């Protein structure tokens, strides 16, 4: 099955930009159908970004213009966050869904900790 590669932690500068890497080697016969990034709120992950057939969707206005997800190379769905705030410190989850040629779906996810440094 696919494996998402995401570092354990990432540190970005206060009021600056950072990239949260999330990559995988695409497998033959696997079609990517959903990409989500989620921020962890206690026990509950909360979607901040969703990519599907219809395009990209940012889920909260506080991210509008600050949030971008790579789309150029298959297998790279890293998340770029600009103008980092102290409140952006959190665990983030990269979550990718694929469909196999028999219609079944496979989901993988992985967690990184975002640190923000003054």
């Amino acid at each position, epitope marked *: 099955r696919p*494996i998402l590669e995401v570092p354990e932690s990432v540190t970005g500068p206060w009021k600056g930009d950072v990239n949260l890497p999330c990559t995988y080697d695409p497998l033959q016969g696997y079609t990517q159908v959903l990409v989500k990034w989620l921020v962890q709120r206690g026990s509950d*992950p909360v979607t901040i970004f969703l990519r599907d057939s219809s395009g990209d969707h940012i889920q909260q206005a506080k991210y509008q213009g600050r949030l971008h997800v790579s789309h150029k190379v298959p297998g790279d769905v890293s998340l770029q966050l600009s103008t980092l705030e102290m409140d952006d410190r959190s665990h983030y989850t990269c*979550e990718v869904t694929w469909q196999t040629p028999d219609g079944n779906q496979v*989901v*993988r*996810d992985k*967690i990184t900790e975002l640190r923000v440094q003054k």
Partner: nanobody
Amino acid sequence: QVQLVESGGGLVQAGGSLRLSCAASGRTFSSYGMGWFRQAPGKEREFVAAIGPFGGTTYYADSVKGRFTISRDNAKNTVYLQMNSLKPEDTAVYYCAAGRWNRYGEQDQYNYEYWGQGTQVTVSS
């Protein structure tokens, strides 16, 4: 860098019980999914059970559901596997493992970043 240490294995009579534990070193134990795998002589390693990060959702292989219980004590950086109604088919080396999956892929061995050294469990008749 993470170090995983299993404790609690050994010899047990069929129908009896054992508790395995795995102590992890590090600062952010609660943000790792923790899993148990086992390998019997002459077979491939297989999933037994897992407990996810944060809230701690539990996952069980069908062959152990109802008989095994997994839990974690985040104050102790420890995960526990309570093994009840043990059968001779449960004889194997049991491995503790730690990964940064969240809600998916918990049975996939490649989804774990750190592997303990494993402890023998033997169920006799």
